[PDB]
Amino acid sequence: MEIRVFRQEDFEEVITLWERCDLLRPWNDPEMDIERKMNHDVSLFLVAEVNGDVVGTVMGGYDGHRGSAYYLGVHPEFRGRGIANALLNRLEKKLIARGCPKIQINVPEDNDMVLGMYERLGYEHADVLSLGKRLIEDE
Amino acid sequence: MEIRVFRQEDFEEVITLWERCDLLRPWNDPEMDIERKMNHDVSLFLVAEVNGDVVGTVMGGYDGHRGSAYYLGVHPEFRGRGIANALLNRLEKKLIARGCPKIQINVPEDNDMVLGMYERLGYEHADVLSLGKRLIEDE
Numbered sequence: 001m002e003i004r005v006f007r008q009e010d011f012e013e014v015i016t017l018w019e020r021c022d023l024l025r026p027w028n029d030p031e032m033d034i035e036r037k038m039n040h041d042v043s044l045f046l047v048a049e050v051n052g053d054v055v056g057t058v059m060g061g062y063d064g065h066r067g068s069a070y071y072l073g074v075h076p077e078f079r080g081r082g083i084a085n086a087l088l089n090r091l092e093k094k095l096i097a098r099g100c101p102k103i104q105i106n107v108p109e110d111n112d113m114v115l116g117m118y119e120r121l122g123y124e125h126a127d128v129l130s131l132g133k134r135l136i137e138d139e
Numbered sequence: 140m141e142i143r144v145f146r147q148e149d150f151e152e153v154i155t156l157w158e159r160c161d162l163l164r165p166w167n168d169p170e171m172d173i174e175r176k177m178n179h180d181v182s183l184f185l186v187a188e189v190n191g192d193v194v195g196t197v198m199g200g201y202d203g204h205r206g207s208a209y210y211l212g213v214h215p216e217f218r219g220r221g222i223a224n225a226l227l228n229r230l231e232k233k234l235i236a237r238g239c240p241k242i243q244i245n246v247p248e249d250n251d252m253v254l255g256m257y258e259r260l261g262y263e264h265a266d267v268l269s270l271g272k273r274l275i276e277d278e
């Protein structure tokens with residue numbers, strides 16, 4: 001099992017993996033989200049490869065004050081093997097390697113399995129409200 | 140009134156301002172936060188100057204997927220002038236200019252004023268839980 005940075009050749013496999021992980025949302029064009037990362041900085045956008053195939057990903061990121069993580073997914077047939085953990089742990093190390101002091105992640109207030117996963121990894125709930133404003137609309 | 144990017148010469152004036160705005164937190168070394176931004180990309184770290192002095196700031200950011208904003212502060216004697224609004228607006232334009240599709244901001248749960256400011260500026264609530272994990276501690 002090997003964790004590495006996303007490459008242009010992984011483009012379609014990654015999207016298909018997102019489809020299978022139910023990570024796609026109508027308001028976020030996945031082609032656009034990948035192109036944004038490619039143009040901005042691909043280095044924290046990781047994939048997990050097992051026997052040559054991409055079976056997991058995490059779109060990590062850093063803005064100069066806090067790290068982030070979106071599109072965390074592991075293919076259904078490859079779950080319960082510690083891949084998401086491996087992914088998150090590698091991101092955290094890449095983040096620390098460049099001076100990132102903290103990582104923040106937003107999770108659906110509904111998903112308990114994911115909430116639990118983050119808690120076991122040492123993440124704690126922040127007493128804040130998350131607000132947002134769309135700047136460029138996707139289709 | 141002029142909004143522009145943070146300059147090294149602004150360092151002590153900004154920290155002093157942050158103290159005056161009660162933005163400092165023990166777990167965040169302000170000097171360290173400024174250096175992180177300088178090393179990563181200073182371009183979205185904006186200051187507002189009036190009559191030659193820095194009277195407002197916003198530490199904007201972009202990670203390749205979402206925009207962010209920290210350290211939003213306006214000197215107490217310069218409030219109710221639209222300075223905070225102008226800082227956020229300019230940050231939004233800079234975000235859009237580089238392709239950022241959306242900005243997110245977490246607000247303390249009980250800060251009614253700030254929550255109201257953002258809603259009034261067109262930011263909507265996300266039904267999500269913010270989780271965080273400290274990666275490098277500041278002393």
Ligand SMILES: CC(=O)SCCNC(=O)CCNC(=O)[C@H](O)C(C)(C)COP(=O)(O)OP(=O)(O)OC[C@H]1O[C@@H](n2cnc3c(N)ncnc32)[C@H](O)[C@@H]1OP(=O)(O)O
Binds near residue numbers: 070074105117
């Ligand atoms: C940034 C984000 O979080 S985006 C939102 C993430 N949500 C999704 O991606 C939804 C789709 N789901 C998935 O892709 C996968 O189920 C993931 C990413 C949630 C989990 O991936 P996996 O590789 O199975 O995780 P991994 O094997 O590292 O498991 C991590 C923990 O979750 C636990 N876990 C995995 N599946 C389940 C389950 N069905 N029920 C309860 N716990 C589970 C594991 O037991 C493990 O905990 P442990 O360390 O205490 O054993």
Ligand SMILES: CC(=O)SCCNC(=O)CCNC(=O)[C@H](O)C(C)(C)COP(=O)(O)OP(=O)(O)OC[C@H]1O[C@@H](n2cnc3c(N)ncnc32)[C@H](O)[C@@H]1OP(=O)(O)O
Binds near residue numbers: 160223
């Ligand atoms: C990333 C972050 O958010 S960091 C956390 C932010 N919070 C803090 O910094 C706490 C310290 N507070 C401050 O420094 C200032 O009070 C700020 C930055 C919140 C606001 O500064 P100001 O320059 O006064 O805000 P500005 O004048 O642009 O007002 C923005 C909008 O919110 C409303 N608002 C803000 N404060 C008030 C107030 N005391 N009374 C009425 N309306 C207010 C304004 O009415 C305005 O809309 P308007 O067009 O109706 O006037």
